[PDB]
Amino acid sequence: VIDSVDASRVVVRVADDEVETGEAGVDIYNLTKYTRSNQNTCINQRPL
């Protein structure tokens, strides 16, 4: 389940079925901002 949605990053929880013993919920997804590509074009990620 998603914990918090932000334009910079998004975090999600880990279910109890597919989890380890210690440190069950660990998921840090850092969304990239407007950076320069190889063709001088913009690239970004928006949470949906």
Next chain:
Amino acid sequence: FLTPRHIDVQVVSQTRAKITLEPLERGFGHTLGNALRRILLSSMPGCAVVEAEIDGVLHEYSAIEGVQEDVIEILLNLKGLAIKLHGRDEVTLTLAKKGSGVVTAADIQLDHDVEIINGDHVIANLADNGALNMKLKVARGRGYEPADARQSDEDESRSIGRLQLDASFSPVRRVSYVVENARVEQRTNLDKLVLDLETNGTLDPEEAIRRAATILQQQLAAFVD
């Protein structure tokens, strides 16, 4: 020989409104219908957000903390607002909200001369770890104008603080006219106009025909003088 008097305004909805002026003479019905259609789309008084200044961000490309949607998507939602200015030509509005609550068009502070038509229009999504605060500035214009053409009100110091938008205000969206038949028991060649006006709500459909009449009369007066 015949002049339209005491027109009728059939308001079927807040946005879409039809009007039937008068049964005119044959030949002048289709002529005035196509003439009035190009006037309502060329130049009409409207108001929109010209610039928006945020005290938490430098440029419009970088996003902020706490807001789900991007800053560019926030500036793209301000264009869809419908703000009506009765007396004042240029007014400054504010907006501030803190907490896990979505912001809408009704979150703007009320004013005695500023009336917003839509209230269900969302702007951005918030959260508990962040908040937003900005100042809005609207103005009265005639037609479409980009941000690079109206280069004014600058002192070579508000570059990093103030952010400009693309003024694309247009109170009229769709215009449709048909030629119907009417009876007056005076002649056989009678026809009326049914203008299917689609206004976003910034102006009343009754004043749209009056404002479109004085502009056409001013253009035709050059032939007399």
